[PDB]
Symmetry: C2
Subunit: 122 residues, 2 copies
Amino acid sequence: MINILVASEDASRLAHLARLVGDAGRYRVTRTVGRAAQIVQRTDGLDAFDILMIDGVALDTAELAAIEKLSRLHPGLTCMLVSADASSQTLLEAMRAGVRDVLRWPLEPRALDDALKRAASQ
Amino acid sequence: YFQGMINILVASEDASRLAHLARLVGDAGRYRVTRTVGRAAQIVQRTDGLDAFDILMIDGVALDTAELAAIEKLSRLHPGLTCMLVSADASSQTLLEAMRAGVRDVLRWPLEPRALDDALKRAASQ
């Protein structure tokens, strides 16, 4: 089984995301209420996870700095961003912060399934 | 200070674009630039030696399904290799494809020396 950490600062959004990830396959899903900036401070344990999924709602400079610090300290961790922002500039920022995939919000189960099978290969 | 430590491989099937790119990479700093005429689809077959390089630059002039498969196979087999794509295509969809194939930076074509300098200093830190 693949071990996935799902993160958001909105519990009702987080619950929804974790269910869809569960419906996508036989993965081991874990939920956390918090920003990337907050997971950076409690970094003790991220080595257990294969995929990190961050809900890119209030995506700014501090959050991108936190994802860059997370991806750089945990190379075996595939970071994915769930955002409604489809701009080239935001994608470029995410890419430069070490994000290896970006899923659209609202989440499409076909898109998510394909995304999780790509990360499962590595 | 010492950039001569950074080994860059520059690749394109178009010798004219390749020469130009390698020239600008040289002007960007004291890096060790190596040129290769060919697609990523061809570099995947001649994989013997990529462990020597820190940055791989691919010309998006030949960007298709086979190239994206080749870049994904290259990036996955060489994690210490930073892959960069030089493309004129600024679409969100192409960026997303590159990202998904393991491309860690995308530079516009025609190449802007300020953009390139910033991009190469970003990859040089890691």
